[PDB]
């Protein structure tokens, strides 16, 4: 077994955010942790992006600090696999490196990883770092500049259940303040940390008792001094003999999860809350402290972190919803909100379910996820590519160029060109334009003029004009009537293409030395000659500007493009990179989308070039073939005119992205999704929270509360507290309007949904597996399977089947209904009397959470006993247990690759693949599935499904969605291919600088607490694709063994076209 994993969509949810002076002393930065990605911003007046890096680990801890005599702040990061590091920001010119000041692994092999997980704290005097990794221990990294491998000592903590810790301000020796739990209740203790005697001395105040659910500790800075303990009913201040205690009624009805210091002295603090409310915590000084106050600011999305920036701007980082930038206002709005959203950052959120549909009924798939939870939950329609919306398309053939023409604002005209002819449209020619003063330019097959010779190549801007007659060049300037000739030169070879985008320079492509050159203007002299190599001439050339940097672009006739870094004064060409895009010669052209200039490349793979991370990205236009193009305003405004081989077209263009995400808000948690094509609509399980009434109500309007048809369950089988109310939503495939909502019984959860046909019945049903859920019980002892048909307009209940457990999973199986009922797998048949009757079942489970099928085979993913393989023996009408993996993997998602190969995600962020052993002594060696591939993903996988986002060397294609919003892809490799990739996997590790100097082999190693094996049968496509973004000096370090660097570009490129 040989698999290749790669990322289709990087993780979107926010684990952490921190604010400080990281890039410079005078810059104010926002640092954001997504899972393995670290984002770095500068605060403007918005956010200017500077650097996004990736690490080889889940970032568990991230805080800035500044040692004595340090120019700017240093960054401390700790990963979940226990990699510690200190990073510095160094920007020596055009280049930016996150350089590793110190690094080390701080794991012990004796250890209970705790509830509340990792906690990472730094001392105010920056003398020390404190970690709580395991119960009863406390690890200490002493921060003198000598300790560069980050060697650490442990102190033993007699408190075996710690909730939160902080270092305090204003303490002689360094002092930790923490809330712990024994019986008796929860308490606050303080220890001082001796660095030289190495263990705990006793602290300032004595041990006080706090609230049963006291959960957060804020350390107030020195003007005040103590610690604030946040709990569910009360906020309290503690300092020695000082104790203030407010218990405001507002904060009762939801839990506070995050906080942030707003005013540096500590007078004001932001509080975030599980239902999305934002609070200000106000310390009123009198340098005593008289009172605490809580004021409600407004609603945000549900905050995982909070960070005040400058000037009333708060960044709200979410993991259950979109992240946002919001403005805090002195004055309330018309509804009492001091909060106002400025910007919103898409989080594909917890992906809890997804399916692949060819919605726009062409050949390209779209993902449709269940995203988010509570009021942030939504569907996301995810489409690959950049689409263009047609508004008119004249069926006109030929066409070898077009231009737009503007005396005020609007574009008005649109000029075409054909062999030797030229038609002009408002319903041969080289250029058409609007130039200085008045008049427009027009350049024909021969002359605007020279000495009976034919112009062969043209170029122009607002004020200057360069034409080429054979190898001769001329320099024209536009003056208040007709064009005065400036310069004259002859090139050593024939001119192929020409650009002068503004003008002190001139880009030129020549005919026999395959050259691209920069020439001074007017001098025409040669500032830089670059040999492109090869034996195909350039077809278009172009200089432009992407995100403040300058570039040269030269399309060759074989569809390759080159791009360099332009100087604009020196004219030097730097950092040659080469991108394949299509097979026929590309025509380059600039256009504007937002306030950015991009480039439209026209080949049989139309592409838009732009700049994301100050690197250039190439993204496909979802069009068959484009030959010419230009921007319009005349079809009408803000548009693109595009000619293909055999007709024209005009229209608008999508956001310039790799992925298009349409978002459908629901204001409740969606839980499962499935497409029913004959009804052209979607079934979505969702739940909403309602609260014990004065009699159950509903906190806000939701998708189920505002459907466009309702119904409520009819069934008489089972004859301020909160509670989930579940529904099946019917969702129009085109408008995504919620057509119908059916509500289930009180305390019934819908956990599983299918859309299938059954038996010889010609109807297509929605089938819902449910469970009766009471917090008292451990597992459910009652649930039901319900058979709905979407008739027209409304849902009617066709069948019902009571069962003795939760229906965790269901799947259509060969005309029958396979189901998991709470540690039993069962097979139902569909009678002519419209009824489910049992056929067989299987009880050798602990909790069958996950089913998938293929032919007569069934993959069963268990709560804790890993995976097992079942068969339906169709003659005997039975289940046959074929084999089983005998490892203690706690499953999250499961998928069948082929009939011999089964894929699985476990709750430790690992992937494995199981095979059928093809060995002798069948009865036991063939009853054991062998793990044949291991790989640490770093993500928790909720769903696999078969399908692909792409199609308008590898085999098969499985997408997966994760809690952190990353969408991933798995595919199969030939053995020829895996060994080659595995090879240059290890060559790339020797060359790629890893942030924190974490080793890639360690990162991807399979890791539980039972065992830690290295990864096998698995290729990290993220790592293989990083080959395209390194030096060519370092590329050649990676080609020592007949191979050439330009050859592996081809291989790695072909693999990027996979997602």
């Amino acid at each position: 077994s040989y698999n290749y994993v790669v990322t289709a969509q990087k993780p979107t949810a926010v684990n952490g955010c921190v604010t400080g002076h990281f890039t410079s002393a005078e810059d104010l930065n926002l640092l954001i942790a997504k899972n393995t990605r670290l984002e770095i911003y500068v605060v403007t007046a918005g956010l200017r992006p500077v650097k996004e890096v990736g690490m080889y680990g889940k970032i568990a801890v991230m805080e800035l600090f500044r040692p004595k005599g340090e120019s700017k702040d240093l960054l401390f990061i700790l990963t979940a696999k226990y990699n510690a590091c200190i990073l510095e920001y160094k920007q020596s010119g055009e280049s930016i490196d996150i350089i590793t000041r110190a690094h080390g692994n701080v794991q012990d092999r004796i250890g209970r990883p705790s509830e509340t997980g990792i906690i990472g704290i730094i001392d105010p005097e920056c003398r020390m770092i404190g970690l709580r990794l395991y119960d009863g221990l406390f690890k200490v990294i002493p921060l003198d500049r000598d300790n560069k491998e980050l060697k650490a000592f442990n102190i033993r903590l007699e408190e075996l259940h710690v909730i939160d810790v902080k270092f305090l301000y204003g303490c002689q020796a360094p002092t930790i303040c923490f809330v712990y739990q024994d019986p008796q209740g929860r308490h606050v203790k303080t220890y001082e940390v001796s660095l030289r005697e190495k263990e705990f001395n006793k602290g300032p105040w004595k041990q006080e008792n706090v609230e049963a659910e006291a959960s957060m500790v804020i350390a107030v800075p020195e003007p005040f001094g103590g610690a604030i303990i946040i709990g569910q009913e009360s906020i309290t201040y503690h300092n020695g003999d000082k104790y203030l205690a407010i218990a405001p009624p507002i904060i009762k009805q939801s839990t506070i999860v995050c906080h942030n210091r707003v005013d540096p002295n500590g007078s004001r603090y932001l509080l975030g809350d599980m239902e999305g409310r934002l609070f200000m915590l106000l310390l009123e000084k009198e340098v005593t402290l008289k009172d605490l106050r809580v004021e409600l600011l407004g609603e945000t999305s549900i905050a995982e972190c909070l960070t005040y920036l400058d000037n009333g701007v708060v960044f709200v980082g979410s993991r259950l919803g979109d992240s946002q930038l919001v403005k805090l206002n002195v004055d309330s709005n018309e509804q009492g909100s001091y909060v106002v959203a400025m910007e919103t950052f898409t989080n594909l959120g917890p992906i809890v379910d997804m399916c692949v549909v060819d919605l726009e009924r062409q050949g390209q798939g779209q993902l449709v996820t269940c995203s988010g939870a509570f009021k942030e939950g939504s569907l996301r329609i995810i489409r690959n590519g950049i689409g263009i919306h047609e508004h008119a398309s004249i069926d006109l053939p030929g066409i070898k160029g077009l231009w737009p023409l503007r005396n005020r604002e609007t574009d008005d005209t649109l000029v075409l060109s054909f062999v030797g002819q030229t038609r002009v449209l408002m319903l041969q020619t080289f250029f058409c334009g609007n130039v200085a003063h008045q008049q427009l330019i027009q350049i024909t097959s021969a002359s605007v003029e020279p000495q009976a010779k034919n112009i062969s190549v043209a170029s122009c801007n607002s004020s200057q004009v360069v034409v080429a007659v054979g190898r001769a060049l001329y320099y024209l300037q536009i003056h208040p009537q007709e064009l005065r000739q400036i310069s004259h030169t002859e090139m050593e070879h024939e001119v192929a293409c020409l650009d002068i985008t503004p003008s002190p320079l001139c880009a030129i492509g020549l005919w026999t030395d395959i050259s691209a050159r920069i020439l001074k203007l007017p001098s025409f002299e040669l500032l830089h000659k670059e040999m492109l190599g090869g034996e195909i001439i350039p077809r278009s050339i172009l200089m432009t500007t992407f995100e403040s940097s300058h570039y040269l672009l030269c399309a060759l006739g074989d569809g390759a493009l080159f791009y360099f870094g332009l100087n604009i004064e020196t004219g030097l060409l730097s950092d040659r990179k080469k991108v394949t895009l299509g097979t026929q010669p590309t025509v380059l052209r600039t256009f504007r989308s937002l306030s950015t200039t991009n480039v439209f490349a026209c080949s049989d793979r139309p592409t838009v070039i732009y700049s994301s991370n100050h690197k250039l990205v190439f993204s496909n236009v979802n069009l068959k073939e484009v030959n010419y193009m230009c921007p319009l305003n005349s079809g009408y405004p803000d548009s693109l005119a595009l000619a293909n081989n055999s007709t024209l077209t005009i229209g608008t263009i999508d956001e310039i992205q790799k992925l298009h995400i349409r978002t459908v808000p629901l204001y409740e948690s969606p839980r499962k999704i499935c497409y029913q094509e004959v009804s052209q609509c979607f079934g979505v399980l969702s739940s909403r929270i309602e609260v014990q009434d004065t009699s159950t109500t509903a906190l806000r309007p939701s998708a189920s509360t505002q459907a466009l048809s309702s119904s409520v369950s009819s069934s008489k089988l089972f004859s301020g507290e909160e509670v989930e109310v579940h529904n099946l939503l019917i969702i129009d495939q085109h408008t995504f309007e919620v057509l119908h909502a059916h509500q289930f019984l009180q305390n019934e959860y819908a956990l599983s949904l299918v859309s299938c046909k059954l038996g010889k019945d010609p109807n297509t049903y929605f089938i819902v597996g449910t469970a009766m859920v009471y917090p008292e019980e451990a597992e459910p002892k009652q649930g039901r399977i319900v058979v709905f048909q979407y008739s027209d307009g409304k849902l009617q209940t066709v069948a019902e089947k009571e069962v003795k457990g939760a229906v965790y999973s269901m799947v259509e199986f060969n005309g029958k209904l396979l189901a998991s009922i709470n540690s039993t797998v069962r097979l139902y048949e569909w009678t002519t009397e419209k009824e489910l009757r049992t056929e067989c079942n299987h009880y050798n489970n602990i909790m069958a959470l996950y089913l998938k099928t293929k032919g007569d085979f069934i993959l069963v993913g268990d709560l804790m006993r890993s995976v097992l393989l079942l068969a339906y023996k169709p003659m005997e009408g039975n289940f046959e247990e074929i084999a089983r993996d005998f490892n203690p993997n706690w499953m999250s998602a499961v998928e069948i690759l082929d009939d011999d190969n089964f894929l699985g995600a476990e709750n430790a962020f690992n992937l494995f693949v199981c095979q059928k052993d093809s060995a002798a002594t069948t009865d036991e060696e063939r009853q054991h599935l062998q793990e044949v591939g291991l790989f640490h993903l770093g993500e928790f996988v909720n769903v696999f499904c078969h399908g692909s986002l792409v199609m308008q060397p590898t085999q098969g294609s499985v997408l997966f969605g994760t809690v952190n919003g990353m969408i991933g892809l798995v595919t199969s490799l030939s053995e020829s291919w895996y060994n080659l990739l595995l090879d240059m996997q290890n060559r790339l590790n020797k060359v790629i600088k890893s942030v924190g100097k974490i080793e890639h082999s360690f990162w991807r190693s399979f890791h539980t607490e039972r065992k830690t094996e290295p990864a096998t049968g698995f290729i990290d496509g993220d790592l293989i694709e990083s080959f395209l973004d390194i030096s060519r000096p370092k590329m050649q370090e990676v080609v020592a063994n007949e191979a050439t660097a330009d050859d592996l570009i081809k291989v790695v490129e072909e693999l990027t076209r996979i997602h």
């Binding site: 956990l751 917090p775 008292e776 451990a778 809690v963």
Partner: peptide, 13 residues
């Protein structure tokens, strides 16, 4: 309760 624990875990709540 397993169902809620599971529902929570899928959120990683």
């Amino acid at each position: 309760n397993a169902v809620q624990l599971l529902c929570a875990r899928t959120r990683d709540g």
